Amino acid sequence: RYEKIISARWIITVETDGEVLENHAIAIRDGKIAAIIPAADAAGLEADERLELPDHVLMPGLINLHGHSAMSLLRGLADDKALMDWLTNYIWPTEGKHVHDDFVFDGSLLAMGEMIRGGTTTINDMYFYNAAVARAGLASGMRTFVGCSILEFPTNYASNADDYIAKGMAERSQFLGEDLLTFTLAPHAPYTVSDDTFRKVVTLAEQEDMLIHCHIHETADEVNNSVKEHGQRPLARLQRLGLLSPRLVAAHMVHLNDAEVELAARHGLSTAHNPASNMKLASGISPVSKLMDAGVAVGIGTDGAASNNKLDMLAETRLAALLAKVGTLDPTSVPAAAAIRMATLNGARALGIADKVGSVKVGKQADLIALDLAQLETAPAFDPISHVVYAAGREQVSHVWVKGRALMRERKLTTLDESDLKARAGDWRNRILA
Amino acid sequence: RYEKIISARWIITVETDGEVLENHAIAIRDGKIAAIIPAADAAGLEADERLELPDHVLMPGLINLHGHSAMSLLRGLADDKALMDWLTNYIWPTEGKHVHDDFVFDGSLLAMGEMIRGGTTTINDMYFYNAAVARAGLASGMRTFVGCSILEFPTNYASNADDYIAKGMAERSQFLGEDLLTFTLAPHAPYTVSDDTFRKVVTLAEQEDMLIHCHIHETADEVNNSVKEHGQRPLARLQRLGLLSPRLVAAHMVHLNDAEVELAARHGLSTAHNPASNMKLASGISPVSKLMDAGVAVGIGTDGAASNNKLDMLAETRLAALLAKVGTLDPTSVPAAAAIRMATLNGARALGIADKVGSVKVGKQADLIALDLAQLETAPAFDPISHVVYAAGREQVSHVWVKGRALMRERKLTTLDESDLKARAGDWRNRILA
Numbered sequence: 001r002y003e004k005i006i007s008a009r010w011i012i013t014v015e016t017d018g019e020v021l022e023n024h025a026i027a028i029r030d031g032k033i034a035a036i037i038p039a040a041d042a043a044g045l046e047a048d049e050r051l052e053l054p055d056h057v058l059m060p061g062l063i064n065l066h067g068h069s070a071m072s073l074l075r076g077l078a079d080d081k082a083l084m085d086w087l088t089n090y091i092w093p094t095e096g097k098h099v100h101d102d103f104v105f106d107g108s109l110l111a112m113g114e115m116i117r118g119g120t121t122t123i124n125d126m127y128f129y130n131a132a133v134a135r136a137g138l139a140s141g142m143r144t145f146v147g148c149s150i151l152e153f154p155t156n157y158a159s160n161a162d163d164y165i166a167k168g169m170a171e172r173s174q175f176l177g178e179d180l181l182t183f184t185l186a187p188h189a190p191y192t193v194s195d196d197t198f199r200k201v202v203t204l205a206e207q208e209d210m211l212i213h214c215h216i217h218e219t220a221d222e223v224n225n226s227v228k229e230h231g232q233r234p235l236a237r238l239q240r241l242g243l244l245s246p247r248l249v250a251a252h253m254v255h256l257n258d259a260e261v262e263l264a265a266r267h268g269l270s271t272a273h274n275p276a277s278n279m280k281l282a283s284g285i286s287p288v289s290k291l292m293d294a295g296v297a298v299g300i301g302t303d304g305a306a307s308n309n310k311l312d313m314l315a316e317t318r319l320a321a322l323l324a325k326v327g328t329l330d331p332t333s334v335p336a337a338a339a340i341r342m343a344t345l346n347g348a349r350a351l352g353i354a355d356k357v358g359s360v361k362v363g364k365q366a367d368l369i370a371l372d373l374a375q376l377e378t379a380p381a382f383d384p385i386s387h388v389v390y391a392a393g394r395e396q397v398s399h400v401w402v403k404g405r406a407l408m409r410e411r412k413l414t415t416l417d418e419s420d421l422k423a424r425a426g427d428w429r430n431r432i433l434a
Numbered sequence: 435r436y437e438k439i440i441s442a443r444w445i446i447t448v449e450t451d452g453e454v455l456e457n458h459a460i461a462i463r464d465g466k467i468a469a470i471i472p473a474a475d476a477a478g479l480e481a482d483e484r485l486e487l488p489d490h491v492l493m494p495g496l497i498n499l500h501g502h503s504a505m506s507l508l509r510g511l512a513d514d515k516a517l518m519d520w521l522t523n524y525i526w527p528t529e530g531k532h533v534h535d536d537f538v539f540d541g542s543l544l545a546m547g548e549m550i551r552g553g554t555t556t557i558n559d560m561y562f563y564n565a566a567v568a569r570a571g572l573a574s575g576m577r578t579f580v581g582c583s584i585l586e587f588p589t590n591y592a593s594n595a596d597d598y599i600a601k602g603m604a605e606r607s608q609f610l611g612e613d614l615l616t617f618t619l620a621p622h623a624p625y626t627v628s629d630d631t632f633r634k635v636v637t638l639a640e641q642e643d644m645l646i647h648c649h650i651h652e653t654a655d656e657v658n659n660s661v662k663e664h665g666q667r668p669l670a671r672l673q674r675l676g677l678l679s680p681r682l683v684a685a686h687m688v689h690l691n692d693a694e695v696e697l698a699a700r701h702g703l704s705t706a707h708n709p710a711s712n713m714k715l716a717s718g719i720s721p722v723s724k725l726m727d728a729g730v731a732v733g734i735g736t737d738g739a740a741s742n743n744k745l746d747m748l749a750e751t752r753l754a755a756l757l758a759k760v761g762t763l764d765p766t767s768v769p770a771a772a773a774i775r776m777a778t779l780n781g782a783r784a785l786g787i788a789d790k791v792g793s794v795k796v797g798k799q800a801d802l803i804a805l806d807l808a809q810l811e812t813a814p815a816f817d818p819i820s821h822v823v824y825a826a827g828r829e830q831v832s833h834v835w836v837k838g839r840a841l842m843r844e845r846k847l848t849t850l851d852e853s854d855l856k857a858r859a860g861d862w863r864n865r866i867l868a
């Protein structure tokens with residue numbers, strides 16, 4: 001028997017741009033999409049649960065390809081600074097004061113509540129105290145990628161690059177065989193990681209078959225300083241070190257010349273486009289249309305809540321579409337169908353799981369969300385693809401499933417206690433202002 | 435006796451950047467802010483109504499300085515086109531088919547429901563069938579500026595420029611002595627209005643003491659074509675015609691050289707910055723920091739729902755702050771306090787009513803909104819100014835007052851029927867797709 005049959009007014013499949021099924025239903029078995037049928041054929045089938053969603057659009061869950069989830073606890077603490085000043089003089093000192101297992105667990109949980117509330121099903125995270133992020137991920141039920149940050153300087157978490165690596169690998173070993181939990185290696189950035197450390201990461205990632213998650217080409221200063229310090233721009237350096245390959249998720253990728261776009265395409269890396277953070281830190285505009293035209297998977301992330309300051313993937317996807325048009329002065333850059341692809345299927349491609357999630361397709365896992373379009377904000381309900389990108393908001397997501405399992409139903413969180421999340425945030429407000 | 439005393443956790447006054455009152459209350463009498471006192475002193479005072487808003491921020495209502503409200507009915511019908519193509523081949527033909535009194539009334543009402551829901555208290559509108567916009571404005575209770583559009587070409591509404599003017603003035607005469615309703619003259623744009631029509635508008639606006647509301651310098655094509663057709667860029671032409679003065683609200687103002695920034699400052703015009711529409715139509719980035727540094731009142735508008743596609747002033751204000759930083763590559767451009775000023779006090783300045791609304795100040799009219807910050811999206815609650823701009827969403831506005839009168843309470847609309855609005859939208863969906 002089917003576990004669930006969910007019928008909706010619209011289904012955006014993301015299998016082909018523009019494809020929207022009307023009055024169809026999704027049958028779910030063993031956590032996967034087992035059938036996609038006219039809703040009329042669905043009552044004749046048996047199911048453990050049945051759900052009718054009139055005036056709702058069903059679509060793949062949104063994939064946040066770049067977050068620092070625990071930074072939810074620092075929301076609004078460090079505005080109006082460019083990247084290096086922001087890290088050096090505000091973020092790193094605050095992180096030195098407050099970041100331990102407790103912070104990371106509490107902050108990750110808070111972030112996950114906010115993400116589920118806005119229709120995010122997968123988070124590609126990157127932080128410290130990775131066992132705490134993993135624990136939070138198993139608790140929330142989100143599809144979770146835990147990025148083990150690697151730096152050269154000592155922190156409360158680890159004393160040197162080898163220690164970040166050893167601790168990440170030790171923590172990874174405590175969460176083996178978890179279908180929805182995946183550890184990655186996350187060397188922080190070209191300007192905080194040495195050639196030797198990058199080589200160790202390449203070797204380890206290859207041996208253990210892990211993704212590499214790294215902030216790359218975020219600022220002009222990073223790129224220009226790299227030439228001075230390493231003799232070439234960061235991408236060329238990383239190519240020399242062996243880092244560019246399909247396992248690499250390159251966050252930001254704001255400052256690129258045309259040769260670097262082709263380099264990315266040839267090595268089959270993916271990028272995470274984080275428009276709010278790129279604007280807020282005054283980093284610049286990633287040439288996402290050029291990357292996508294070259295065949296590169298460009299997903300979308302939010303970055304952390306201290307440089308956004310939302311974890312809202314619908315808002316982030318709209319912003320990607322708007323910024324692409326203003327940056328190219330071409331109104332046909334990133335149409336709504338492409339933006340949805342960025343927020344879903346391209347994220348899955350980046351994470352090496354596009355055969356598993358990212359579209360509404362029989363055989364794929366049921367990572368799905370439903371948006372209630374019967375609100376003034378999305379009225380009249382003409383084209384749901386257009387509305388999802390340009391009009392709908394995080395507040396309209398009504399239901400969230402990961403592998404067929406409900407994480408939210410009629411905006412009630414089913415795996416996390418929303419009151420508990422608010423209380424942890426209030427605790428941290430007191431502790432940080434202390 | 436006070437009509438209302440509203441106590442809140444935070445009050446953002448907008449009287450000085452950064453000023454936030456904690457645990458204070460606003461006493462309202464005769465539609466105006468009569469006192470701002472510590473909340474402890476408030477129970478000792480008598481009031482017809484008392485309201486406690488723990489974890490809420492109270493602030494001035496948001497002022498949408500540029501809308502085409504009835505276009506709510508066209509939401510998502512015309513994406514991925516640049517301005518002239520969009521108007522010529524999509525918008526104007528659709529407007530020729532569907533726009534009459536009924537469309538404008540229904541569409542304005544729908545827009546007003548969405549605007550109130552997101553904390554907008556004043557709308558500077560610009561459309562056709564102005565008596566219908568006026569009627570909708572009196573119904574909703576919003577502070578409403580009705581912009582009587584003037585074009586040269588015949589439409590269902592009017593046959594020539596003189597007819598747009600005569601009809602607007604006739605309709606204005608039916609709504610005299612309304613405190614919350616103000617008619618303006620709205621010549622459409624430099625490229626749709628002749629020198630003779632502009633002169634008639636200058637003369638009429640002076641005689642009747644009316645504001646002038648006009649789309650100016652929206653695109654590079656407009657500015658370059660003006661030189662060919664009129665011998666000078668549009669602002670210089672309008673200066674020659676007498677249009678630049680404090681009564682002018684110049685919408686868009688995207689393509690400006692430094693001489694035009696100073697011209698604007700010298701004539702004391704204001705601009706409406708409409709970032710989503712400027713990005714979506716691929717028009718460009720208005721140099722709002724330069725204008726503001728020169729002393730020009732720069733407010734924020736949404737434009738119409740077919741080029742946004744939201745009427746969300748919180749989202750529009752965040753976008754203004756983000757776009758300013760990425761466009762100048764200066765993270766200190768448009769800090770959150772300045773963005774709030776743009777969305778409130780600068781709108782009031784533009785509309786010539788900054789002595790009346792736009793800040794929380796004794797003697798001013800009680801155009802106020804309350805946002806519930808006790809949500810995951812704005813947790814932890816550190817600085818409410820930062821959160822309002824970078825984290826809070828339209829869904830968190832709980833209460834709206836215009837002149838002390840509640841237009842929304844705990845997200846229930848008090849002057850409009852939300853079900854009726856949804857039904858009109860559904861009616862129009864059917865009629866437009868027919």
Ligand SMILES: O=c1[nH]cnc2c1ncn2[C@@H]1O[C@H](CO)[C@@H](O)[C@H]1O
Pocket residue numbers: 068083087091092095126127128149186188189215218277303304307
């Ligand atoms: O946009 C960013 N660029 C570079 N570093 C960042 C950004 N956001 C957060 N972090 C920092 O990266 C570390 C986790 O890998 C943390 O120190 C976090 O504060």
Ligand SMILES: O=c1[nH]cnc2c1ncn2[C@@H]1O[C@H](CO)[C@@H](O)[C@H]1O
Pocket residue numbers: 348349350351352353354355
């Ligand atoms: O555009 C794509 N379509 C399908 N799969 C893709 C695409 N790009 C990368 N992959 C990757 O190919 C493998 C088999 O599906 C998976 O690793 C998937 O992520």
Ligand SMILES: O=c1[nH]cnc2c1ncn2[C@@H]1O[C@H](CO)[C@@H](O)[C@H]1O
Pocket residue numbers: 502517521525526529560561562583620622623649652711737738741
């Ligand atoms: O961003 C814009 N620029 C120019 N015209 C516009 C824009 N948005 C809507 N209209 C058009 O202006 C008229 C009302 O004055 C309407 O025809 C409307 O469709």
Ligand SMILES: O=c1[nH]cnc2c1ncn2[C@@H]1O[C@H](CO)[C@@H](O)[C@H]1O
Pocket residue numbers: 782783784785786787788789
């Ligand atoms: O920065 C300002 N502060 C106060 N009033 C202003 C400002 N700019 C323009 N006005 C205008 O001056 C008159 C008296 O207050 C009003 O017309 C108001 O809108």
Ligand SMILES: [Cl-]
Pocket residue numbers: 194195196
């Ligand atoms: Cl080195």
Ligand SMILES: [Cl-]
Pocket residue numbers: 628629630
């Ligand atoms: Cl002329």
